[PDB]
Amino acid sequence: SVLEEARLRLHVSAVPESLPCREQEFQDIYNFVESKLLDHTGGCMYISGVPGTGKTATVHEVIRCLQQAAQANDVPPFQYIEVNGMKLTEPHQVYVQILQKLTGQKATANHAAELLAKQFCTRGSPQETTVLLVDELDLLWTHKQDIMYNLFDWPTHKEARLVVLAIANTMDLPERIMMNRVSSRLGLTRMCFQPYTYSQLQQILRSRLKHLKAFEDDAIQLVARKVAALSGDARRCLDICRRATEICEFTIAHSMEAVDEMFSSSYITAIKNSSVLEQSFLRAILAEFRRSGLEEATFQQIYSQHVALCRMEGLPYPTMSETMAVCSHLGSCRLLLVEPSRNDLLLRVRLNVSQDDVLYALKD
Amino acid sequence: HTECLSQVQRILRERFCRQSPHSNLFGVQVQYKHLSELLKRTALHGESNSVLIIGPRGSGKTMLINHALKELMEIEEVSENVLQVHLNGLLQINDKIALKEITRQLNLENVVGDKVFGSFAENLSFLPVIFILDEFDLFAHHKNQTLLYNLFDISQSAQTPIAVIGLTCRLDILELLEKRVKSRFSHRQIHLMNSFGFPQYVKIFKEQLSLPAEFPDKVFAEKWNENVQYLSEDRSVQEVLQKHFNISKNLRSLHMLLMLALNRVTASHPFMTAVDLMEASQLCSMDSKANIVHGLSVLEICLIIAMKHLNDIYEEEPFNFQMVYNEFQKFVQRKAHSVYNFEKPVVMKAFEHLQQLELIKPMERTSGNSQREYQLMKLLLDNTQIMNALQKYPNCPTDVRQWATS
Ligand SMILES: Nc1ncnc2c1ncn2[C@@H]1O[C@H](COP(=O)(O)OP(=O)(O)OP(O)(O)=S)[C@@H](O)[C@H]1O
Ligand SMILES: Nc1ncnc2c1ncn2[C@@H]1O[C@H](COP(=O)(O)OP(=O)(O)OP(O)(O)=S)[C@@H](O)[C@H]1O
Numbered sequence: 001s002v003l004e005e006a007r008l009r010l011h012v013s014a015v016p017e018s019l020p021c022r023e024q025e026f027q028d029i030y031n032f033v034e035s036k037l038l039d040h041t042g043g044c045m046y047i048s049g050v051p052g053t054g055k056t057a058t059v060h061e062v063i064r065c066l067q068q069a070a071q072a073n074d075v076p077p078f079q080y081i082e083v084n085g086m087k088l089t090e091p092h093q094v095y096v097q098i099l100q101k102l103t104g105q106k107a108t109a110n111h112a113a114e115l116l117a118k119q120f121c122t123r124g125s126p127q128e129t130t131v132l133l134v135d136e137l138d139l140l141w142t143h144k145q146d147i148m149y150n151l152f153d154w155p156t157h158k159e160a161r162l163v164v165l166a167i168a169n170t171m172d173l174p175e176r177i178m179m180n181r182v183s184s185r186l187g188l189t190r191m192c193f194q195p196y197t198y199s200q201l202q203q204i205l206r207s208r209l210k211h212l213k214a215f216e217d218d219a220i221q222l223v224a225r226k227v228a229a230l231s232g233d234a235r236r237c238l239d240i241c242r243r244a245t246e247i248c249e250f251t252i253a254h255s256m257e258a259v260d261e262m263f264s265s266s267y268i269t270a271i272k273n274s275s276v277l278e279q280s281f282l283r284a285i286l287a288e289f290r291r292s293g294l295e296e297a298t299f300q301q302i303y304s305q306h307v308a309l310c311r312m313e314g315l316p317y318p319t320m321s322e323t324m325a326v327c328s329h330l331g332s333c334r335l336l337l338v339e340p341s342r343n344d345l346l347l348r349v350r351l352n353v354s355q356d357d358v359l360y361a362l363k364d
Numbered sequence: 365h366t367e368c369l370s371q372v373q374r375i376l377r378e379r380f381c382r383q384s385p386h387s388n389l390f391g392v393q394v395q396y397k398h399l400s401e402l403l404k405r406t407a408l409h410g411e412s413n414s415v416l417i418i419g420p421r422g423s424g425k426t427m428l429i430n431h432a433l434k435e436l437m438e439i440e441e442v443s444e445n446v447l448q449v450h451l452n453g454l455l456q457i458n459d460k461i462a463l464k465e466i467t468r469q470l471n472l473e474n475v476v477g478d479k480v481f482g483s484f485a486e487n488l489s490f491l492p493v494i495f496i497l498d499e500f501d502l503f504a505h506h507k508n509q510t511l512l513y514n515l516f517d518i519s520q521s522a523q524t525p526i527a528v529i530g531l532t533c534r535l536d537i538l539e540l541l542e543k544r545v546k547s548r549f550s551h552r553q554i555h556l557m558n559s560f561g562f563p564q565y566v567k568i569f570k571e572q573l574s575l576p577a578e579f580p581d582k583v584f585a586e587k588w589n590e591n592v593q594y595l596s597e598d599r600s601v602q603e604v605l606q607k608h609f610n611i612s613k614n615l616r617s618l619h620m621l622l623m624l625a626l627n628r629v630t631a632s633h634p635f636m637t638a639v640d641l642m643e644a645s646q647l648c649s650m651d652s653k654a655n656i657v658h659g660l661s662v663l664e665i666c667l668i669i670a671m672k673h674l675n676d677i678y679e680e681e682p683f684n685f686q687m688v689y690n691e692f693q694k695f696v697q698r699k700a701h702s703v704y705n706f707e708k709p710v711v712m713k714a715f716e717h718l719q720q721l722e723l724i725k726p727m728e729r730t731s732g733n734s735q736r737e738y739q740l741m742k743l744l745l746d747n748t749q750i751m752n753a754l755q756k757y758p759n760c761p762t763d764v765r766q767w768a769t770s
């Protein structure tokens with residue numbers, strides 16, 4: 001079916017071959033790495049960008065192009081090694097991972113570091129240029145900063161023949177997280193990926209759905225515009241498109257439903273579906289807050305206000321245990337803030353949502 | 365006779381205590397339809413999805429998953445290809461233990477290895493399997509959320525199909541995740557609320573206490589159905605149900621109340637009565653503080669009255685043993701010759717016993733520097749509670765009562 005084909009095309013893992021939306025950045029990286037590969041000299045580049053900008057996809061596509069060029073005997077052969085920071089149980093274990101990727105030897109963290117140091121500092125046998133990719137750099141931080149210093153200092157050696165690309169989300173990292181000597185080592189080589197404009201998002205969506213007339217232009221334009229105005233991320237755009245397809249299986253209404261179901265908060269409807277006693281408790285809290293003006297109140301005054309409200313409403317007199325159970329249930333779903341493990345009558349209560357939202361939910 | 369009572373007791377005890385699966389589903393038609401449809405999509409094809417289910421505890425979160433699995437696993441031979449892994453946040457508190465449980469459940473310990481080696485690339489390199497994550501909120505409190513990130517990554521990868529299911533009671537589960545995993549998390553959420561009125565709750569109660577059609581005796585089953593139907597419209601039973609429904613709409617409390625009601629079913633009374641439900645509701649709705657106060661002694665009552673007087677004179681301020689002793693001495697000295705000639709150590713032991721029952725708690729705890737005397741103590745009771753408890757005290761003397769009134 002057409003909807004099934006659109007769902008298949010719009011999946012996240014269905015990476016395209018090459019989209020010129022980032023062709024400029026691709027070209028810049030293609031010049032830099034090509035220069036580092038032609039001169040038999042190492043280098044380092046730091047790239048910072050918000051998630052969803054295609055950093056990993058762009059790097060992998062550049063690696064694919066470089067490997068294809070090497071296969072066409074135009075570039076000297078190179079060894080590619082990829083490591084992910086968040087896929088490692090311990091920080092020091094990255095030394096074992098790289099060593100096992102290059103020689104397959106098993107050694108301790110310190111011994112693996114020493115062997116890697118010996119290989120990268122001593123004039124050994126002439127090896128292929130090493131392309132090292134490290135993902136999620138900020139998660140390799142250590143109070144001693146030895147791992148980061150070694151990672152960004154080793155390619156400085158002529159014998160290293162190592163090119164390192166660091167992908168991260170924060171551009172401030174080399175300034176406030178990295179010390180001076182290594183900050184100057186990554187200085188002036190910082191690539192920032194700006195978020196896609198709504199035109200770029202529309203171009204990407206059109207490329208996803210070439211030769212397929214399944215969505216109207218209006219839904220596509222609105223989805224790209226919401227994405228631009230909220231995060232400018234292709235991942236949530238694909239999720240919205242898939243949800244719109246699912247709802248259409250059941251127009252602009254589908255996209256609106258997707259965006260206001262996957263982004264909007266459910267606090268209002270949760271309060272609406274609350275019980276009568278919980279509503280009375282919330283009203284008592286609001287009345288006590290208006291009387292006092294403070295954002296913290298003990299359980300005793302709230303209980304007194306609840307008893308007064310119940311007397312006004314004609315409800316039966318509530319026991320302390322019942323009110324405590326209701327409060328504990330409310331705190332379980334993170335609508336309030338309380339520590340009722342030991343304190344019972346002296347519990348500080350803070351609202352987890354804005355007062356105006358509570359008023360707008362309770363007026364109806 | 366006795367055999368029928370034993371069989372029905374066993375069946376209802378299995379229904380309530382163990383929470384055995386039942387075909388009856390209440391107000392969850394759309395949610396179950398969505399969940400089953402997505403499970404079938406993930407099973408019959410290589411596509412991957414991630415879903416979180418949010419609801420209050422005791423709202424049958426596990427029942428939906430169990431019913432859907434029992435409905436869809438036995439459709440075809442897909443269950444042979446389908447593998448299921450269940451993880452609970454309580455049993456697995458560390459990533460090492462979670463990895464060990466994952467390896468043992470997959471019967472890959474022979475492939476991966478037996479020793480305590482920290483390498484997990486044996487599974488990672490090799491990696492349809494479905495994942496069930498009980499208490500998903502606890503996993504977000506780990507040091508680095510490595511397991512959750514890896515699961516999301518393999519779900520988003522194009523290597524193997526993986527289905528991830530998480531259970532959460534917190535409504536703020538979206539803000540407990542890091543930016544990366546939140547971006548990689550497919551925003552599929554299902555909310556389990558008791559969105560039904562009181563008459564629907566009455567229908568649920570009527571159906572739950574109804575014998576199944578597979579019971580051997582049919583005329584007795586029909587008579588039981590007639591009894592429960594007749595008991596359905598009784599205004600005392602309706603009043604008890606209305607009270608419990610006002611308190612909370614969770615089905616777990618209703619199951620507990622029904623179980624306690626069935627405990628009073630004997631041979632002489634094969635069919636229940638509204639008075640039985642009244643007794644069960646009364647037993648289920650008693651406050652513990654008044655019960656604790658009722659079991660005290662005279663000296664403790666006098667000390668508590670002195671404590672209330674201290675709280676009244678000094679508005680919301682702490683106190684120590686010396687002031688209470690001084691004003692108890694004042695009370696026993698105003699009276700001419702009352703029989704309360706007690707020394708310091710017995711009063712000190714009484715205060716220690718009162719503090720042991722955790723009716724009084726210290727402030728800014730310290731020891732050695734400050735003795736038990738001259739220590740800031742506070743009371744954890746309300747004046748109306750004391751008055752109500754003292755009203756029901758069996759043999760409260762007139763003197764102490766009038767002192768309390770003063
Ligand atoms: N050139 C591109 N044009 C359009 N969409 C793209 C492009 N490159 C990547 N994408 C899409 O955007 C998604 C995000 O790509 P990633 O590289 O994984 O994100 P990232 O920028 O590396 O940030 P994280 O936090 O590391 S996932 C990809 O999975 C694709 O679906
Ligand atoms: N929609 C429903 N259909 C059938 N039974 C339900 C439904 N909702 C709740 N229940 C019943 O409610 C009772 C209590 O639910 P539980 O199964 O104890 O909660 P849970 O699903 O285990 O969630 P947690 O957070 O793990 S305690 C069970 O006996 C369920 O059969």
Ligand SMILES: [Mg+2]
Pocket residue numbers: 055056057
């Ligand atoms: Mg990435």
Ligand SMILES: [Mg+2]
Pocket residue numbers: 425426
């Ligand atoms: Mg459960």
